[PDB]
């Protein structure tokens, strides 16, 4: 559905910046109120609608 | 009110301006000061001190780094070292000969995988041999 | 990467499942043992 939730999943392989500005091009392609946050201790951070942020 | 818990995997500092997004996203009032000794302050209403102390607590119970020991009984802990220091963190004592670790519960899943992956003990290769000489 | 223990004796691998497909076949491409070359041999005189 529509609903805003967050949700954390890990990349191991390399840092996860690397996937900034494409990551805020789905944060761009669709409406916003969500975040990436991309942890240093590589983890993942979404929040926004589950489609997007799925 | 104010509400004080702990993040002591980074320093906090890191979670300012996202923090102070919350102190924007709703009224202020609020504080959150990160002090250098790593624990975490806000002051401000209780739910958006609380989404805040939940952002704070998601880089505490985030990245877990601690460390282990477990008794290496076989390979030499020195050499579990080593094997491991080609991998690109570890401790080990051959007093008691065991890994220890600093580092993640995965850091604890994947080393205790290799806790157990070379615990191995080679089997005896007669390595020297008594020969009885019939004759010479 | 590569790493081995002569421990063990044994090939670790830092890398790909590509690595491990690869890196199974050099696992197994240079296992062989050579064959006895006879290097010594005790040679029986039968005169001298």
Do not use: W
């Amino acid at each position: 559905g529509d609903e805003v939730i967050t949700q954390v999943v890990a990349v191991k392989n390399v840092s996860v910046r690397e996937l900034s500005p494409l990551l805020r091009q789905l944060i761009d392609n669709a409406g916003a109120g969500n975040v990436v946050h991309y942890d240093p201790a590589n983890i993942i951070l979404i929040t926004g609608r589950a489609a997007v942020v799925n | 009110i104010t509400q004080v818990v702990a993040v002591k995997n980074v320093s906090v500092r890191e979670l300012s301006p996202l923090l102070r997004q919350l102190i924007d996203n709703a009224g202020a009032g609020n504080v959150v000061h990160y002090d250098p000794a790593n624990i975490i302050l806000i002051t401000g209403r209780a739910a958006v001190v609380n989404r805040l102390a939940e952002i704070i607590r998601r880089v505490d119970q985030a990245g877990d780094k601690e460390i282990e020991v477990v008794e290496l009984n076989n390979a030499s802990a020195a050499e579990m070292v080593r094997i491991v220091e080609a991998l690109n963190k570890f401790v080990a004592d051959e007093r008691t000969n065991s890994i220890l670790i600093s580092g993640d519960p995965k850091v604890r899943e994947r080393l205790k995988r290799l806790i157990k992956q070379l615990d191995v003990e080679m089997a005896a290769k007669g390595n020297n041999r008594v020969v009885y000489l019939k004759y010479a």
